[PDB]
Amino acid sequence: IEPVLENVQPNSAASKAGLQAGDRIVKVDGQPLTQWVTFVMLVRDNPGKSLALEIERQGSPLSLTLIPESKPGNGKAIGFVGIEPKVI
């Protein structure tokens, strides 16, 4: 799966973090992003933890900080950033 975003929900976590449509996640917390499932599980499990993202906007790197919104979940407090993945 291509680690590109399609849209960012307004007034969400990825909105205040600076993420935009077309941005490509490259690194998360230092280590590169080879599996999109790792970033998905990091956004899911961590509910209010600062995640350092190295993205490539327009082909150029940029450093942002993402703080997932603690969306209510039955099992446990879940993390929602408001990112729409790339349409397959």
């Epitope: 909105s15 350092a52 790197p61 940029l62 450093s63 900080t65």
Partner: antibody, heavy 116, light 108 residues
Framework: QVQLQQSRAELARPGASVKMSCKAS????????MQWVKQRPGQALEWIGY????????KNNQKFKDKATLTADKSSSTAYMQLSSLTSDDSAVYYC?????????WGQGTTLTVSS | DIVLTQSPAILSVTPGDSVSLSCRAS??????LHWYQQRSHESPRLLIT???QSISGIPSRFSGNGSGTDFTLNINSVETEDFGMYFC?????????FGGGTKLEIKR
């Protein structure tokens, strides 16, 4: 809680070089992108460029291709901007800003006067 | 090179009316446009992020709308601490560019 301490005012001889600082206080300095913007007295803002502390990647505007040189130091938590080959058109107020998309936290302003 | 055009450059308003500042672009920046307020002899202040999304710090009277290649910043009841320069900055492509600037003066 989050402050950007910029260098004090500067006077420079024409043709020399200057190197101003922007010490960040109150956040993880390596995860947020630093931005440098120019403003001449009475005119609009002018985006000089940005830099990623920790990785050292600096991307400047095409006008500030070689005029501006962006560096970063993680330990001192300080981003430096160097201006080489100074002319009269370099007299302006220079700001540093936080974040890589929108500029949330701004600095005080380093005023550079280039005269002999 | 996305050239943000901020028109007009100066607008005089009686301290109490509404203000709609324009900021037309040249290419599709979608909703990647933010507004900044600069008071005289000060540093810029972040007002609205991404066209309409409000920031945690600005009063309720500051809002805005627009998309693509047309944006508008709305100030409802203008107080005395609202005059000065206003700039629009796009973050869609490279390089980042600011607006021409709109000056808010008091009417007399």
């Amino acid at each position: 809680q989050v402050q950007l301490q910029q260098s004090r005012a500067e006077l420079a001889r024409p043709g020399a070089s200057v190197k101003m600082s922007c010490k960040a206080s109150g956040y993880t300095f390596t995860t947020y992108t630093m931005q440098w913007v120019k403003q001449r007295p009475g005119q609009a803002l002018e985006w000089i460029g940005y830099i990623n502390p920790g990785s050292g990647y600096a991307k400047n505007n095409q006008k500030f291709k070689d005029k501006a040189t962006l560096t970063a130091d993680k330990s001192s938590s300080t981003a430096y901007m160097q201006l080489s080959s100074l002319t009269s058109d370099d007299s302006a107020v220079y700001y540093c800003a936080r974040s890589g998309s929108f500029f949330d936290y701004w600095g005080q302003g380093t005023t550079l006067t280039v005269s002999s | 090179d996305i050239v943000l055009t901020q028109s007009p450059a100066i607008l005089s308003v009686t301290p109490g009316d509404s203000v709609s500042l324009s900021c037309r672009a040249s290419q599709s920046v979608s909703s990647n446009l933010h507004w900044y307020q600069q008071r005289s002899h000060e540093s810029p202040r972040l007002l609205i992020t991404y066209a309409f999304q409000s920031i945690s710090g600005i009063p309720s009277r500051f809002s805005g709308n627009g998309s693509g290649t047309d944006f508008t910043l709305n100030i409802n009841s203008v107080e005395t601490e609202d005059f000065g320069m206003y700039f629009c900055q796009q973050s869609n492509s490279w390089p980042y560019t600011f607006g021409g600037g709109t000056k808010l003066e008091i009417k007399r």
